[PDB]
Amino acid sequence: SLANTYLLQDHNTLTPYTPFTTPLNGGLDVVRAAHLHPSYELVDWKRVGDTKLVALVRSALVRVKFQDTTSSDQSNTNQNALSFDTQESQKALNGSQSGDFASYVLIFKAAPRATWVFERKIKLALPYVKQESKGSLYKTLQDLLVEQPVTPYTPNAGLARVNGVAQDTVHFGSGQESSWNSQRSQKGLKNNPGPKAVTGFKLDKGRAYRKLNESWPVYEPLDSTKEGKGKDESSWKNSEKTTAENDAPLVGATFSKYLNTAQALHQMGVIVPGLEKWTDALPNVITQLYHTSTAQLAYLNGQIVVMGSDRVPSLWYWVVGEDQESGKATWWAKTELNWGTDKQKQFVENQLGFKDDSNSDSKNSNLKAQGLTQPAYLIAGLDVVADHLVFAAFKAGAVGYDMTTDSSASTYNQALAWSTTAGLDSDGGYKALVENTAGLNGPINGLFTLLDTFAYVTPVSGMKGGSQNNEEVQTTYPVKSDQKATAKIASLINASPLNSYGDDGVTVFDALGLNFNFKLNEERLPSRTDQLLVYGIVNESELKSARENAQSTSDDNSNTKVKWTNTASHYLPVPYYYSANFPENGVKISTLESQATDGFANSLLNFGTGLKAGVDPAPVARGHKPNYSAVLLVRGGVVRLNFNPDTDKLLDSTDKNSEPISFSYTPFGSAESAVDLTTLKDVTYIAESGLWFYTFDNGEKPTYDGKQQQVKNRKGYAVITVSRTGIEFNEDANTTTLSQAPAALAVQNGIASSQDDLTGILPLSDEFSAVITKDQTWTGKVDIYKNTNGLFEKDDQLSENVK
Ligand SMILES: CC(=O)N[C@H]1[C@H]([C@H](O)[C@H](O)CO)O[C@@](O[C@H]2[C@@H](O)[C@@H](CO)O[C@@H](O[C@H]3[C@H](O)[C@@H](O)[C@H](O)O[C@@H]3CO)[C@@H]2O)(C(=O)O)C[C@@H]1O
């Protein structure tokens, strides 16, 4: 309708367009309208109702700090260890000219014409954590290790971290490993067929792992097996920093040992000084986490949610009241989510670190010892529907590591992570497979050779062990029985959905989804830690609980969790055909080549981007509430998340063996596989047509690659139409329970170019859509496109008519 206006974004300016493909005025520069500093950048905005506009702004000059050790009581009050450092904010100002810089949620109100009047601003404060002089999350943060982010130029070998020591040498030792079977019963590994099963990966070499107050380096290794220092900050700081500088320099030099990804970091949410719109080192890891934890938002009946970036893991999220001026963040570490079953929740928790009633060490800082759940997630997106919030995220790999000073220790300088893929002898049906004991508490998977046919998963699992096939197949944490009280396992977090980075085919099969059973009814065996997708519907009362958790000043509720019961996990691997060696001795991570075109140099790690909810316009049954489902885009396919509208819960069936109806993955075609997932600038859903539109701006690609060469195909656009498929819930009268999950379908409709810069796209009608282009002076090249079922092509007559 002529009366309705479409809002298009250009940096900070929100220009309102008419269905005549013309602006109604210059637009609204949110930064200036909110009376904020020029360093502020607009990242996410949501049009609320008709008389409201909510936005998300973040300054690159923001500087955060975590105060660790050297303190006493008597004078120290209820102060937060996480606080804004104004000292470095005024120091970082030196860029061009001037004449806490915290993120803000902005509220606007509609005035006559296409104008907005500034109403109020809500401060997005740091999450609360009690300082020191089993209720202490502070210890975890004191000894926390976070990996440098994954760039679209990071190759497969860059993630490949050298395999650790087997659990037979951990519990027994070097020289007496041959007594595995004869003594595994009393050690807690009864019928365990995995002696040479790798416990994790070594941390002495590879991609840098930096603490909260330490900083991520711009240079990353091509092959983490040969080059890189990993956790060793002092080894980098003293000689390897200069090694990476001379070999990998910025444009202003062989590139054989390291890669310069400064441009790639900036185009993710990472603050890179000297490379901004308006050598040295990048800001604190805790500061980068804050700058990346403010990328997405949603508004519900007076509540504003804020979540992290889809490329950088977020350790917290905001839930702030409209009336509130401030509002501290809620941790994911204190947010208990339903993983589908009680066993599915266990797998991830029982890898976060070491926990036993024997240990009570100050250096035993791991989440499990501090009684905390999964702390990080790569938020694919969020949305609101039927007075309820809906989210989807790729669970970031949070594991443990040995902080021992004893170099002779087998687990010394290594992170503990094992393959959690269900055994080959596991019972059929989703529930029976996801609940399988295979690596619940410790390693079990690895290379098992059956005559001449090798298998990367355990052939003996559950309770089918022993002789009579009744004996339990035991599994336990890779820490020696007598070393349990003195154990100092801390917490480590990865920048990908992988728990394990160990250079082996077992971790390759978890990432690519190649673990199957030898049954005629071939079922794909699931990982319960690697390539995991979390999704769920959260209500206003569950949301309020997250706010109250953040607003708490330690006191008694320093351990208390946020209960989100309507959530579930799902094993979502990358396609195998995305990797060159498996097309449509063996191989490991480093030996895996990439043939991936979706704007990723790695054919190993998965990426979930741009989630959007939507109410199916289809006529519903006599009484029943209108059906709704949320859709997101992953590597190699479209995934639809279904929900029950009559109860505002996750859609579940009568039979537990049958795969969940709440989850559905539809793999997409050849044309849509050439689409870069990182270039997504907008996700629009049309209520009247029931179609999703994924608008990819080529300009969202960085300036230079890892080898500091100008990025090609930066000019252009590509659109993906996502439509519903299959039988829906309450499609007719007799439709009660569903056996097959209602899915979606991704197709590159026809709205695509590689020669023009995109201003945006206007959905004029169900039949016609417009394409506004940039580049030259003024900007306003309009192109009218027509469709049928979804096939798009430009109407030469109407395009020439507007122009
Ligand atoms: C993850 C892991 O470490 N798997 C092991 C497995 C498991 O230990 C086993 O499945 C359960 O205990 O054993 C593997 O060992 C076999 C392998 O070394 C082959 C090599 O040819 O030999 C087999 O032994 C045979 C062989 O004929 C002689 O060595 C022996 O005198 O008789 C045996 C037959 O009775 C080993 O069992 C396996 O691949 O199955 C090695 C894995 O690393």
CSV table of C-alpha atoms in Angstrom, one decimal, residues 313-616:
chain,number,residue,atom,x,y,z
A,313,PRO,CA,31.2,-16.4,20.6
A,314,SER,CA,29.1,-14.5,23.2
A,315,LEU,CA,29.6,-15.2,26.9
A,316,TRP,CA,26.5,-13.2,27.9
A,317,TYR,CA,23.2,-11.6,26.7
A,318,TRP,CA,21.0,-8.6,27.8
A,319,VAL,CA,17.3,-8.6,28.9
A,320,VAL,CA,16.5,-4.9,29.8
A,321,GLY,CA,13.2,-3.2,30.8
A,322,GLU,CA,11.9,-0.2,28.8
A,323,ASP,CA,11.6,1.9,32.0
A,324,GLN,CA,15.2,1.0,33.0
A,325,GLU,CA,18.0,3.5,32.2
A,326,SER,CA,20.7,0.8,33.0
A,327,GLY,CA,20.5,-3.1,32.9
A,328,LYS,CA,23.4,-5.5,33.5
A,329,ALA,CA,24.0,-8.6,31.3
A,330,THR,CA,23.0,-12.2,32.1
A,331,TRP,CA,25.7,-14.9,31.6
A,332,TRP,CA,25.0,-18.0,29.5
A,333,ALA,CA,27.2,-19.8,32.2
A,334,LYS,CA,24.3,-19.1,34.6
A,335,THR,CA,21.5,-19.8,32.0
A,336,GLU,CA,20.4,-23.5,32.1
A,337,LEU,CA,19.0,-24.6,28.7
A,338,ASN,CA,17.2,-27.9,27.9
A,339,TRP,CA,19.4,-29.9,25.5
A,340,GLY,CA,16.5,-32.3,24.6
A,341,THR,CA,17.1,-34.9,27.3
A,342,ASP,CA,18.9,-35.2,30.7
A,343,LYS,CA,21.7,-37.2,28.9
A,344,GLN,CA,22.1,-34.6,26.1
A,345,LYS,CA,22.7,-31.9,28.8
A,346,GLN,CA,25.2,-34.2,30.5
A,347,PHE,CA,27.6,-34.7,27.5
A,348,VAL,CA,28.4,-30.9,27.2
A,349,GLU,CA,28.6,-30.3,31.0
A,350,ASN,CA,30.8,-33.4,31.5
A,351,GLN,CA,33.5,-31.9,29.3
A,352,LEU,CA,33.5,-28.3,30.7
A,353,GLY,CA,36.2,-29.5,33.2
A,354,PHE,CA,37.0,-31.8,36.2
A,355,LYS,CA,34.6,-32.3,39.1
A,356,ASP,CA,35.0,-34.7,42.1
A,357,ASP,CA,34.2,-34.6,45.9
A,358,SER,CA,38.0,-35.1,46.4
A,359,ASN,CA,39.2,-31.9,44.6
A,360,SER,CA,38.9,-28.5,46.5
A,361,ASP,CA,41.9,-26.6,44.8
A,362,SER,CA,41.9,-22.8,44.2
A,363,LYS,CA,43.4,-23.5,40.7
A,364,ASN,CA,40.5,-26.0,39.9
A,365,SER,CA,38.6,-23.1,38.2
A,366,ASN,CA,36.6,-25.1,35.6
A,367,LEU,CA,32.8,-24.5,35.1
A,368,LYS,CA,31.8,-28.0,36.4
A,369,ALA,CA,33.7,-27.4,39.7
A,370,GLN,CA,32.0,-23.9,40.0
A,371,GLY,CA,28.6,-25.6,39.0
A,372,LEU,CA,28.0,-23.7,35.8
A,373,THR,CA,26.5,-24.7,32.4
A,374,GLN,CA,27.6,-24.0,28.7
A,375,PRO,CA,29.0,-20.3,28.8
A,376,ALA,CA,29.3,-19.5,25.0
A,377,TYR,CA,27.1,-19.6,21.9
A,378,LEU,CA,27.5,-18.3,18.2
A,379,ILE,CA,24.0,-16.6,18.1
A,380,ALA,CA,22.7,-17.4,14.6
A,381,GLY,CA,19.9,-15.0,15.4
A,382,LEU,CA,16.7,-14.1,17.4
A,383,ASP,CA,13.1,-13.0,16.7
A,384,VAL,CA,9.7,-12.4,18.4
A,385,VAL,CA,6.4,-14.1,17.6
A,386,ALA,CA,3.0,-14.6,19.5
A,387,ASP,CA,4.3,-12.7,22.7
A,388,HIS,CA,7.4,-15.0,22.8
A,389,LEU,CA,11.1,-14.7,21.9
A,390,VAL,CA,12.6,-17.4,19.5
A,391,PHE,CA,16.4,-18.0,19.2
A,392,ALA,CA,18.9,-20.2,17.4
A,393,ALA,CA,22.7,-20.6,18.0
A,394,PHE,CA,25.7,-22.8,17.2
A,395,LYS,CA,27.0,-23.9,20.7
A,396,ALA,CA,30.7,-22.8,21.0
A,397,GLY,CA,33.1,-25.5,22.2
A,398,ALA,CA,33.8,-25.0,25.9
A,399,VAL,CA,36.3,-27.6,27.3
A,400,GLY,CA,38.9,-28.0,30.1
A,401,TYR,CA,42.7,-27.9,30.3
A,402,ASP,CA,45.6,-28.9,32.7
A,403,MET,CA,47.3,-25.8,34.4
A,404,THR,CA,50.1,-28.1,35.8
A,405,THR,CA,53.7,-26.9,36.2
A,406,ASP,CA,54.9,-30.5,36.1
A,407,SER,CA,56.2,-30.9,32.5
A,408,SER,CA,56.5,-34.8,32.8
A,409,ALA,CA,52.7,-35.0,33.1
A,410,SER,CA,51.0,-36.5,30.0
A,411,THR,CA,48.1,-34.0,30.1
A,412,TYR,CA,50.6,-31.1,30.6
A,413,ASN,CA,50.1,-28.3,28.0
A,414,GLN,CA,46.9,-29.8,26.5
A,415,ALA,CA,43.1,-29.2,26.3
A,416,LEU,CA,40.7,-32.1,27.2
A,417,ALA,CA,38.1,-32.9,24.4
A,418,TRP,CA,36.9,-36.3,23.1
A,419,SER,CA,34.6,-37.5,20.3
A,420,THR,CA,31.0,-37.9,21.6
A,421,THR,CA,29.6,-39.8,18.5
A,422,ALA,CA,27.2,-42.7,19.4
A,423,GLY,CA,28.6,-46.2,19.2
A,424,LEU,CA,28.1,-48.6,16.2
A,425,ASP,CA,26.1,-51.1,18.4
A,426,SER,CA,23.7,-48.2,19.6
A,427,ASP,CA,19.9,-48.8,19.4
A,428,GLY,CA,17.9,-47.3,16.5
A,429,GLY,CA,15.8,-44.2,16.7
A,430,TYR,CA,16.8,-40.6,17.5
A,431,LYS,CA,16.2,-40.7,21.3
A,432,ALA,CA,18.1,-44.1,21.7
A,433,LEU,CA,21.1,-42.7,19.6
A,434,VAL,CA,21.4,-39.3,21.3
A,435,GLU,CA,21.2,-41.0,24.8
A,436,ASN,CA,24.0,-43.5,24.0
A,437,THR,CA,26.8,-43.6,26.6
A,438,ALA,CA,29.6,-43.4,23.9
A,439,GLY,CA,32.0,-40.9,25.5
A,440,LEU,CA,29.6,-39.5,28.2
A,441,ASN,CA,32.3,-39.0,30.9
A,442,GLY,CA,35.5,-39.7,28.9
A,443,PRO,CA,37.3,-40.8,25.6
A,444,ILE,CA,36.1,-44.0,23.8
A,445,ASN,CA,36.2,-43.2,20.0
A,446,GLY,CA,39.1,-43.6,17.6
A,447,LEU,CA,40.4,-45.8,14.8
A,448,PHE,CA,39.0,-49.4,15.2
A,449,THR,CA,40.0,-51.8,12.3
A,450,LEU,CA,37.4,-54.5,11.4
A,451,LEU,CA,39.5,-57.0,9.2
A,452,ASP,CA,40.4,-54.3,6.5
A,453,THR,CA,37.4,-51.9,7.1
A,454,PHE,CA,38.3,-49.2,9.7
A,455,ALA,CA,35.7,-47.4,11.9
A,456,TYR,CA,36.2,-44.1,13.7
A,457,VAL,CA,33.4,-44.8,16.2
A,458,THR,CA,33.3,-47.4,19.1
A,459,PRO,CA,31.9,-50.8,18.2
A,460,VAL,CA,31.1,-51.6,21.8
A,461,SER,CA,28.9,-49.1,23.7
A,462,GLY,CA,26.0,-48.7,26.3
A,463,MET,CA,25.6,-52.0,28.2
A,464,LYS,CA,26.4,-54.5,25.3
A,465,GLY,CA,30.0,-55.0,26.6
A,466,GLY,CA,31.7,-57.9,28.2
A,467,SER,CA,30.8,-61.5,27.2
A,468,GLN,CA,27.0,-61.9,27.9
A,469,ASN,CA,26.4,-58.4,26.3
A,470,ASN,CA,24.9,-57.1,29.6
A,471,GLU,CA,28.2,-55.6,31.1
A,472,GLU,CA,28.2,-51.7,31.1
A,473,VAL,CA,30.7,-50.0,28.8
A,474,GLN,CA,32.3,-47.5,31.3
A,475,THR,CA,33.7,-44.1,30.5
A,476,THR,CA,35.6,-41.6,32.8
A,477,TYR,CA,37.3,-38.1,32.7
A,478,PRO,CA,41.0,-38.1,31.6
A,479,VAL,CA,42.6,-37.4,35.0
A,480,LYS,CA,44.7,-40.0,37.1
A,481,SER,CA,42.8,-41.6,40.1
A,482,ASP,CA,45.5,-40.5,42.7
A,483,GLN,CA,46.0,-37.1,40.9
A,484,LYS,CA,42.3,-36.2,41.4
A,485,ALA,CA,42.7,-34.2,44.6
A,486,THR,CA,45.7,-32.2,43.2
A,487,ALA,CA,44.1,-31.7,39.7
A,488,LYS,CA,44.0,-28.1,38.4
A,489,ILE,CA,41.7,-28.3,35.3
A,490,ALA,CA,40.6,-24.8,34.3
A,491,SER,CA,38.1,-23.6,31.5
A,492,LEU,CA,38.8,-23.1,27.8
A,493,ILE,CA,36.4,-21.7,25.1
A,494,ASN,CA,36.6,-22.0,21.3
A,495,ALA,CA,35.6,-19.5,18.5
A,496,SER,CA,33.7,-22.4,16.6
A,497,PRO,CA,30.9,-24.9,17.5
A,498,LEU,CA,33.7,-27.6,18.0
A,499,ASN,CA,34.6,-29.0,21.4
A,500,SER,CA,37.6,-30.8,19.9
A,501,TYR,CA,40.3,-29.4,17.5
A,502,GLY,CA,42.5,-32.6,17.6
A,503,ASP,CA,44.0,-33.2,14.1
A,504,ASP,CA,42.4,-36.6,13.3
A,505,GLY,CA,39.8,-38.3,11.1
A,506,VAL,CA,37.6,-38.9,14.2
A,507,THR,CA,37.1,-35.1,14.6
A,508,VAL,CA,36.8,-34.8,10.8
A,509,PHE,CA,33.9,-37.3,10.8
A,510,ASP,CA,32.1,-35.4,13.6
A,511,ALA,CA,32.4,-32.1,11.6
A,512,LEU,CA,31.5,-33.6,8.2
A,513,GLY,CA,28.8,-36.1,9.5
A,514,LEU,CA,30.4,-39.3,8.1
A,515,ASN,CA,29.8,-41.5,11.2
A,516,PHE,CA,27.1,-44.1,10.1
A,517,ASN,CA,26.2,-47.7,11.2
A,518,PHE,CA,26.7,-50.7,8.9
A,519,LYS,CA,22.9,-51.5,9.0
A,520,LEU,CA,20.7,-51.7,5.8
A,521,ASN,CA,18.7,-49.0,7.7
A,522,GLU,CA,21.9,-46.8,7.7
A,523,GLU,CA,21.5,-44.2,10.5
A,524,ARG,CA,23.9,-41.2,10.9
A,525,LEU,CA,25.5,-41.5,14.4
A,526,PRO,CA,25.3,-38.2,16.3
A,527,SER,CA,28.0,-36.2,18.1
A,528,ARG,CA,26.8,-34.7,21.5
A,529,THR,CA,29.4,-31.9,21.8
A,530,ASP,CA,30.7,-31.2,18.2
A,531,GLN,CA,28.6,-29.3,15.6
A,532,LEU,CA,25.7,-28.7,18.0
A,533,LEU,CA,22.7,-26.3,17.2
A,534,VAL,CA,20.7,-24.9,20.1
A,535,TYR,CA,17.1,-23.5,19.5
A,536,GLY,CA,14.1,-22.5,21.6
A,537,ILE,CA,11.0,-20.5,22.5
A,538,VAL,CA,11.3,-18.4,25.7
A,539,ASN,CA,8.3,-16.7,27.3
A,540,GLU,CA,8.1,-13.2,29.1
A,541,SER,CA,8.2,-14.9,32.6
A,542,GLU,CA,11.4,-16.9,31.6
A,543,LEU,CA,12.8,-13.6,30.1
A,544,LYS,CA,12.0,-11.7,33.4
A,545,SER,CA,14.0,-14.4,35.3
A,546,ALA,CA,17.1,-13.6,33.2
A,547,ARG,CA,16.7,-9.9,34.1
A,548,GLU,CA,16.4,-10.7,37.9
A,549,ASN,CA,19.5,-13.0,37.6
A,550,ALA,CA,21.6,-10.1,36.1
A,551,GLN,CA,20.2,-7.4,38.6
A,552,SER,CA,21.4,-9.7,41.5
A,553,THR,CA,24.4,-8.4,43.6
A,554,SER,CA,25.9,-11.9,44.4
A,555,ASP,CA,24.4,-12.2,48.0
A,556,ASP,CA,22.8,-15.8,48.1
A,557,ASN,CA,22.0,-16.3,44.4
A,558,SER,CA,25.7,-16.4,43.2
A,559,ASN,CA,25.0,-20.0,41.8
A,560,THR,CA,21.2,-19.8,41.0
A,561,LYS,CA,20.4,-20.6,37.3
A,562,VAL,CA,18.0,-19.2,34.6
A,563,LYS,CA,15.5,-22.0,33.7
A,564,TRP,CA,14.7,-22.2,29.9
A,565,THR,CA,12.8,-25.5,29.5
A,566,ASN,CA,11.5,-24.9,26.0
A,567,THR,CA,14.8,-25.5,24.2
A,568,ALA,CA,16.6,-28.4,22.5
A,569,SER,CA,19.9,-29.4,20.9
A,570,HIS,CA,20.5,-30.9,17.5
A,571,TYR,CA,23.6,-32.4,15.8
A,572,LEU,CA,24.1,-30.2,12.6
A,573,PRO,CA,27.3,-31.1,10.8
A,574,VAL,CA,28.8,-29.5,7.6
A,575,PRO,CA,28.2,-31.5,4.4
A,576,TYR,CA,31.0,-34.0,3.4
A,577,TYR,CA,30.7,-32.9,-0.3
A,578,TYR,CA,31.8,-29.4,0.9
A,579,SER,CA,35.3,-30.9,1.5
A,580,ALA,CA,37.4,-31.7,-1.6
A,581,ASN,CA,38.7,-35.2,-0.5
A,582,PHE,CA,35.1,-36.6,0.0
A,583,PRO,CA,33.1,-35.4,-3.1
A,584,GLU,CA,29.5,-36.2,-4.2
A,585,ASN,CA,46.6,-44.4,6.7
A,586,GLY,CA,43.6,-42.2,5.9
A,587,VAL,CA,43.1,-38.4,6.4
A,588,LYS,CA,43.0,-35.8,9.3
A,589,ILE,CA,42.1,-32.1,9.7
A,590,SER,CA,45.4,-30.7,8.2
A,591,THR,CA,45.1,-33.1,5.2
A,592,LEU,CA,41.5,-32.0,4.5
A,593,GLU,CA,41.1,-29.7,1.4
A,594,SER,CA,38.3,-27.2,0.9
A,595,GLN,CA,36.1,-26.9,-2.3
A,596,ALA,CA,33.7,-24.6,-0.4
A,597,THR,CA,32.4,-21.5,-2.2
A,598,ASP,CA,30.0,-20.1,0.5
A,599,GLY,CA,32.7,-17.6,1.5
A,600,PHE,CA,34.7,-19.8,3.8
A,601,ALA,CA,38.3,-21.1,3.3
A,602,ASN,CA,37.6,-24.0,5.7
A,603,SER,CA,35.4,-27.1,4.9
A,604,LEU,CA,35.4,-28.1,8.6
A,605,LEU,CA,33.5,-25.5,10.8
A,606,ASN,CA,29.8,-24.8,10.5
A,607,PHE,CA,28.0,-21.4,10.4
A,608,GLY,CA,24.4,-20.5,11.3
A,609,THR,CA,23.3,-17.1,10.1
A,610,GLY,CA,20.2,-14.8,10.1
A,611,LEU,CA,17.2,-16.3,11.9
A,612,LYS,CA,13.7,-15.1,11.2
A,613,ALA,CA,10.3,-16.2,12.7
A,614,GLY,CA,7.1,-16.2,10.6
A,615,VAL,CA,3.4,-17.0,10.9
A,616,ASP,CA,2.1,-19.3,8.1
